[PDB]
Design a binder for this molecule. Structure first.
Ligand SMILES: NC(=O)c1ccc[n+]([C@@H]2O[C@H](COP(=O)([O-])OP(=O)(O)OC[C@H]3O[C@@H](n4cnc5c(N)ncnc54)[C@H](O)[C@@H]3O)[C@@H](O)[C@H]2O)c1
Ligand SMILES: NC(=O)c1ccc[n+]([C@@H]2O[C@H](COP(=O)([O-])OP(=O)(O)OC[C@H]3O[C@@H](n4cnc5c(N)ncnc54)[C@H](O)[C@@H]3O)[C@@H](O)[C@H]2O)c1
Ligand code: NA
Ligand code: NA
Lengths: 495, 495
């Protein structure tokens, strides 16, 4: 049962000014299952106005962190109450398996749980005295809500990616304007209903669905948006930051990757190593920012590892995401599907081997299904090696030495995550410093915790999500200097 | 004795490729006293190459914080050894009084002293374990040098503004490329000589003089500059950030202000309050970012306060900055001089009173001297009230209530500093939260400490200089997750 909602502005459901709507497409069946509102510039001004009013009123602009946490704990409780419907809708809306969708629903409530406790602790650290080598000055640092924040998010983890920004923004005390992806907005709109259901103060959270240049764009060039927190592709981040530059507006950039997985011959279990290699590149149909999309395996175990990988890979169940025991679903859209398959075909033109998958599963007549693909005979000058595919596609390379492995791992414009599979501690530490990234996985690929800073360097962007970082991004920092002497400054001659 | 240097690149003095030079102008005498090298795009590539090589070599890319601190403590010791020549040159080069120039020389050494100790402590907090609710995962945060950093700085505190970025960049372990203002580059180039004199590793610090679009510009669009730390005017920050957006490059923005000074009738000393009001708007010939350029005085004391202010003001000695007991010098350039006087004249056209100064001092035939100016009969729709003047110009307004005072204080596009002069504690706290800025001064205007976060919000930009913030800006943050279980992931069916 697909819901039909409006834009969530000022605590009420509000229709878009131009009355425009965009379809909801089912990636498993290529059918229109509904429609979402498509906001425009005028809608963004109404939502910024609603956000500014929330910041000026008492039930939001004057709340303690503890008061704000009561609300986040209540949003977590509704997510957990409706886990089954939300997980089904996230699945029907993004193509993600019901299992991953329910797993993202647990993660979402856990994120509000984390930011609830952090909002309660925020009241304590609001005032931080800093000792000085002065008998005339008194100093402290005042932490306060930054104000109006624009939250532009991607479709890969529709609710989860949004929540990474919503949970800390609200914890910090900001009034947010959430703009999710036009490919997966069902759960974000439902978040609006949860907020109505928990009585969240009006304008505290504003959810605006619609096209990126149409609804995301004006938020980036709005003179009353204190900050834009952006997650998505690099070319989009450029456009956003370029617009935010005109208004000297701060913007955070969480972008893509071509993260490497380095496996060395000293692995205790070839079956556990291959299972992590699968999860790092085929979970979420490969549509993961930190996906370990380049496998740099040692020549020694390369022969053994590839056999187990492909055995495990050919075992991945590709079916309808709502089905029982499904391990792989379709990609999000038709445009994504073609781009992904164009990458597989471009690897053929260039001279690479398609050792596994690469074609459409013969049993699924409808939907954007791509077989999990493992490509070999890959050189550094190839687009497959060079660029983020965002499909269940893995390219493979061999090495002999540590130096060779480092060299290959860092031969990328990206710098999000990296995984190092080895039993040698000091080699795992060497890789910890050599990896020109923001995330290092030791003896796994992909698990994260709220308590940790998420982000990259190079073409993967700047800024850190999660941890205390994710909350501090939405805090304005005040220097409070007080002069405590009766004595005059002594600079300037007295009349 | 004016020095004639080259560009400081890779530990050696290197000539600019195009052989171009730009003059050094004396603001007190309007004479060419020398020339500085004017770097171009090709020069920026050589310096980025030098910076990348320093990051790849052992004597810089492998140093401990303690090793880096030995160097900063040595740069501080040379600054203090040559205090007298550097202070004279800063004065001849910027127009700043020898007193303020020597005071900036003390501040500079103190800043390296602060960042030396912070570099020593950096080694300890390099690895930070974060406890988890997991018996299978182990996590910690790795802090490391960010890499190659571009440091674009203004002429108001030539050496001091540069040092605010140089001291933390070098403490953090980055290889910096310093680009100072073409109006005041004498001391920054001399910093190059100090670095030669202390044996600072090659490429660790690269100093590139020259025009902003010519030498600052390519640094902003260079693909191998990890981050741009920018201080200067808003329109410049736009151009820099717009260029950094193409390469999704992080950039910090320390911009201008129209900071208010709120004085209430409950002041214990009218003479101490007026002296701080002078220092906040006439020190450095008003060329201060955080200058308290708008005085919102209470109607009650307005009559009394203005008499003492003007009495103290008419007492300010305007002479040659190298002279004995000089309290005000000339503005930096001819272009600045005209812009500043155009503001004073624009206040006349608009309907304001020029209660004090506004004209050129009758006794100085040469130089860009402007009398300290106090303008009254000022309304909110006036450019004088609205925009940063960057001259010794103060505009004045009266109020009756707290609400009226807050309203006037925040009626600006800026948001750098703010000063509140009152004996009422809870009123000083109310103003602490109401002031829509990044710096609050209680019972003073302008003093800062290294230990404090410097920066603003709104049109004054984003990011924080100084404190641990200033060092963390130059640290890449790594998430280190390690899987410690023998058990398989359980996601994906085993073959
Ligand atoms: N670094 C991270 O933490 C992280 C997390 C998740 C996804 N990602 C990256 O996100 C990408 C997938 O997301 P996507 O396909 O939604 O990216 P995208 O760039 O197409 O769009 C992301 C969001 O920006 C909006 N948008 C598009 N054009 C815009 C414009 N002109 N102005 C303003 N907003 C605009 C979209 O509507 C959407 O909400 C991949 O590259 C992936 O690696 C990164
Ligand atoms: N917020 C702070 O902490 C702080 C501190 C000091 C000064 N300031 C602000 O700085 C301003 C005074 O400085 P200014 O006159 O040197 O400012 P500016 O904008 O004219 O230039 C600053 C620097 O940028 C360079 N630059 C100019 N155009 C450039 C371009 N196209 N690309 C790259 N670099 C370019 C200049 O050569 C110089 O080094 C005032 O507005 C003042 O309030 C702010
Ligand atoms: Na869709
Ligand atoms: Na000059």
């Amino acid at each position: 049962p697909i819901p039909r909602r409006q834009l969530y502005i000022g605590g009420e459901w509000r229709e878009p000014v131009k009355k425009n709507r965009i379809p909801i497409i089912n990636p498993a069946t290529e059918e229109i299952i509904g429609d979402i509102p498509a906001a425009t510039a005028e809608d963004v001004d109404i939502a910024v106005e609603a956000a500014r009013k929330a910041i000026a009123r008492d039930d939001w602009g004057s709340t303690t962190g503890a008061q704000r946490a009561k609300y986040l704990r209540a949003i977590a409780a509704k997510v957990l109450e409706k886990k089954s419907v939300l997980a089904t809708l996230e699945s029907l809306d993004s193509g993600k398996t019901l299992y991953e969708s329910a797993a993202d629903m647990d993660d979402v409530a856990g994120c509000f749980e984390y930011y609830a406790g952090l909002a309660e602790a925020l009241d304590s650290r609001r005032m931080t005295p800093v000792n000085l080598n002065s008998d005339s000055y008194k100093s402290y640092v005042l932490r306060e809500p930054l104000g109006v924040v624009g939250l532009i998010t991607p479709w890969n983890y529709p609710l989860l990616m949004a929540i990474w920004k919503v949970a800390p923004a609200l914890a910090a005390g900001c009034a947010a304007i959430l703009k999710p992806s036009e490919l997966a907005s069902i759960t974000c709109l439902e978040l609006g209903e949860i907020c109505r259901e928990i009585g969240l103060p009006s304008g505290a959270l504003n959810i605006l669905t619609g096209l990126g240049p149409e609804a995301g764009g004006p938020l980036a060039s709005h003179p009353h948006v204190d900050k834009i927190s952006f997650t998505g592709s690099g070319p989009t981040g450029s456009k956003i930051m370029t617009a935010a530059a005109q208004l000297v507006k701060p913007v955070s950039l969480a972008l893509g990757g071509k993260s490497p997985i380095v496996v060395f011959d000293d692995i205790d279990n070839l079956d556990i190593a291959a299972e992590w290699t699968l999860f790092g590149i085929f979970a979420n149909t490969g549509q993961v920012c930190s996906a370990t999309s380049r496998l740099i395996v040692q020549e020694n175990i390369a022969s053994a590892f590839m056999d187990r990988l492909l055995k495990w890979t050919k075992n991945i169940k590709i079916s309808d995401p709502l089905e029982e025991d499904c391990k792989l679903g379709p990609v999000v859209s038709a445009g994504q599907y073609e781009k992904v398959l164009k990458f597989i075909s471009n690897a053929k033109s260039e001279g690479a081997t398609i050792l596994c998958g690469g074609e459409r599963p013969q049993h699924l007549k409808k939907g954007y299904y791509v077989q999990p693909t493992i490509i070999t005979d890959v050189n550094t000058s190839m687009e497959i090696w060079k660029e983020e595919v965002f499909g269940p596609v893995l390219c493979v390379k061999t090495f002999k030495t540590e130096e060779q492995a480092i060299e290959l791992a860092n031969d990328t414009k990206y710098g999000l995550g990296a995984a190092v599979m080895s039993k040698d501690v000091k080699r795992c530490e060497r890789f910890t410093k050599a990896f020109q990234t923001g995330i290092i996985w030791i003896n796994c690929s992909q698990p994260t915790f709220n308590e940790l800073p998420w982000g990259g360097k190079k073409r993967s962007g700047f800024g850190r999500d999660l941890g205390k970082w994710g909350l501090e991004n939405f805090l304005n920092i005040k220097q409070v200097t007080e002069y405590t002497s009766a004595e005059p400054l002594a600079f300037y001659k007295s009349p």
